[PDB]
Amino acid sequence: QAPKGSAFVRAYNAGNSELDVSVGSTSLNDVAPLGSSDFKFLPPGSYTAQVGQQSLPVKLDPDSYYTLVSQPGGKPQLVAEP
Numbered sequence: 001q002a003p004k005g006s007a008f009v010r011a012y013n014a015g016n017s018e019l020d021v022s023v024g025s026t027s028l029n030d031v032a033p034l035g036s037s038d039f040k041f042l043p044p045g046s047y048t049a050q051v052g053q054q055s056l057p058v059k060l061d062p063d064s065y066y067t068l069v070s071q072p073g074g075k076p077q078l079v080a081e082p
Contacts, residue, residue, distance in 0.1 A: 007044045007060035011051050012036040014071035019052025023060075051076075 002008075011021045013031040021028040023039065024047035031037045031051070041047070041060060049058035051070035058068055058078055065081035 002040065003042060005044060005062040006040055006042050007062055007064055007066070008038060008040045009049065009058060009060060009066040009068055010036055010038050011049075012067060012069045013052070014069050014074065014076075015052065017052075017072070019054075019070060019072070021051050023047045023049045023058070 011031050013019050013033060013035050016033045018030050018032060021031055028039050029037055044060050044062040046057060046059040049056050049068055053072035054070040054076045056076055056078060058066060067079040069077040
């Protein structure tokens with residue numbers, strides 16, 4: 001059971017190479033080609049969601065899930081999922 005106030009974000013790799021994932025000031029695990037990895041943070045707020053060649057100012061609201069599509073050299077897409 002996740003604690004109330006926490007937030008989730010999916011680092012989706014839409015490219016064909018490993019991407020370096022890091023949200024805000026936290027270094028996260030790399031994501032495999034055409035793969036994805038779910039991450040979570042206790043403290044909600046606005047963070048810089050860097051995913052390899054992409055970097056989006058993804059705001060993480062409390063008690064909410066996010067899916068971030070990172071497409072190197074293409075167009076990224078953030079999806080909110082309360």
